Amino acid sequence: QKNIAAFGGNPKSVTLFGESAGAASVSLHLLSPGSHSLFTRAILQSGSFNAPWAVTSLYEARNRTLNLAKLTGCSRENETEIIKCLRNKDPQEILLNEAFVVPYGTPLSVNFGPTVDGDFLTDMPDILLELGQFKKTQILVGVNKDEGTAFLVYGAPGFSKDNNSIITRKEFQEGLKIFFPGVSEFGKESILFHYTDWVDDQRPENYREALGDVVGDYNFICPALEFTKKFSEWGNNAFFYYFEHRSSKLPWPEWMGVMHGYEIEFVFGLPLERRDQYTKAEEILSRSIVKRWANFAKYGNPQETQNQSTSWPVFKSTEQKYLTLNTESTRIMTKLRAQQCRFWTSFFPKV
């Protein structure tokens, strides 16, 4: 705000964009009254603060601060004395102990993250979202087709980047234990139930695909769609995309599909670099995404107006139109993961 005019920029036309925790951050700036006047609009790539990894409760937070003290020989009496001790520790001694403040972590553990501090965040963010207490502006929100797969190779039994990861029923069950460690037996059976009614050939990859869907729907896609619904109910324009292109250069194996984080290079326009070995179709998809992001930032409308492109409709409650981003045919579709999200959003929270 203070300096960008000197570089030829317009402080009145600032768009935030971010991916994963970076997207959850963009979403919290839409909520924080101290950020309201520092930006114009927002773009959220695979993340939002209502994802179940994004915000730590006060209770877990103090428990984690105190466990960190026990581990560093910093358990004290005066709280300000705990911190003063902690300031004397070598940064390495703090990093080494971070993983252990939690009794069981998952590959998506966020040990130290946003909290309701009464300053940045004045109330529980789900309450602010629901009651319309956020900056009124346009948003662009999206997710990748295979969000969940990247995490399976960081602890799910029977998975591996170096084979096809065909797993059994029993391995799937063990995998729900790895990803949902605090959850009751019934809570875990209910997941198995929703995701294993096969249609239907006895395909060997049934369980492998189901486990990636479980992880992506719960952690990324359903919270993104739900954030988008509630936000657009207060009258602002929203645009939703489903990214479904697997990079020709992806070094992870094929079963992992269109992974978490692998739209970013298209957004930054790396395939525009011809001397770089992306394909021609990839250059053109990146060039269209670049123009759409740029139009959204400048004009609040992510259209590509010159090349007979598919027109991107606004996302509303009720119709829930979204746009697919791929190398062949750009399509408008409706009600992404409708059945799955009813499960995660209206049933599972009760569990």
Ligand X SMILES: *[C@@H]1O[C@H](CO[C@H]2O[C@@H](C)[C@@H](O)[C@@H](O)[C@@H]2O)[C@@H](O[C@@H]2O[C@H](CO)[C@@H](O)[C@H](O)[C@H]2NC(C)=O)[C@H](O)[C@H]1NC(C)=O
Ligand Y SMILES: *[C@@H]1O[C@H](CO)[C@@H](O)[C@H](O)[C@H]1NC(C)=O
Ligand Z SMILES: *[C@H]1O[C@H](CO[C@H]2O[C@@H](C)[C@@H](O)[C@@H](O)[C@@H]2O)[C@@H](O[C@@H]2O[C@H](CO)[C@@H](O)[C@H](O)[C@H]2NC(C)=O)[C@H](O)[C@H]1NC(C)=O
* Binding residue ranges for tacrine: 260
Q: Which of 172, 208, 178 minimizes the C-alpha distance to 192?
A: 172
Among 212, 296, 304, 340, binds ligand Y (CB under 6 A): 304
Task: Identify whether the C-beta of residue 332 lies closer than 8 Å to the C-beta of residue 205.
Answer: no
332-334/321-325 β-pairing: antiparallel
Q: Which residues are catalytic?
A: 20, 147, 260
C-beta of 18 vs 158, nearer to ligand X: 158
C-beta of 7 vs 186, nearer to K ion: 186
What are the C-alpha distances in Å from 260 to residues 124, 143, 251, 255, 264?
27, 8, 13, 13, 9
CA distance 134 to 128: 7
Whether the bond between 162 and the residue before it is cis, its omega within 30 degrees of 0, is no
Among 14, 61, 71, 116, binds ligand Z (CB under 6 A): 71
CA distance 237 to 234: 9
Among 118, 182, 235, 251, binds a second copy (CB under 8 A): 118
Residue type, 50: N
Of the candidate spans 28-36, 171-179, 184-192, 315-323, the one that interacts with K ion by CB under 5 A turns out to be 184-192
CA distance 212 to 159: 11
Binding mask 85-104 for ligand Z (x = CB under 6 A): ---------------x--x-
Binding mask 255-284 for Mg ion (x = CB under 5 A): ------x-----------------------
C-beta of 52 vs 157, nearer to ligand X: 157
- CA Rg, the chain, in Å? 22
In a 3-state reduction of DSSP, which class is residue 115? coil
Minimum distance between the CB of residue 332 and Cl ion, rounded to whole angstroms? 5
Minimum distance between the CB of residue 53 and ligand Y, rounded to whole angstroms? 21
CA distance 150 to 256: 7
Binding mask 154-193 for ligand X (x = CB under 6 A): ---xx-x-xxx-x---------------------------
Per-residue tokens: 285: 């998809």
CA distance 68 to 75: 9
> Among all chains, which residue has been given the structure tokens 């965040």?
121
Residue 132 as a binder of a second copy (CB under 8 A): the answer is yes
* 334 beta partners: 321
C-beta of 21 vs 272, nearer to Ca ion: 21
Among 10, 317, 334, 346, binds Cl ion (CB under 5 A): 334
41-45/139-144 β-pairing: parallel
Residue 308 as a binder of ligand Y (CB under 6 A): the answer is no
CA distance 98 to 55: 17
Footprint on this chain of ligand X (rule: CB under 6 A): 157-158, 160, 162-164, 166
Residues in contact with a second copy by CB under 8 A are 33, 118-119, 122-124, 126-127, 130-133, 186, 189-190, 193, 197, 199-202, 279-281, 284, 295, 298-299, 301, 303, 305-306, 308, 328, 331-334, 339, 347, 350
Which residues make up the interface to ligand Y (CB under 6 A)? 10, 12-13, 33, 78, 80, 284, 287-288, 291, 304, 306-307
Which residues lie near Cl ion (CB under 5 A)?
334
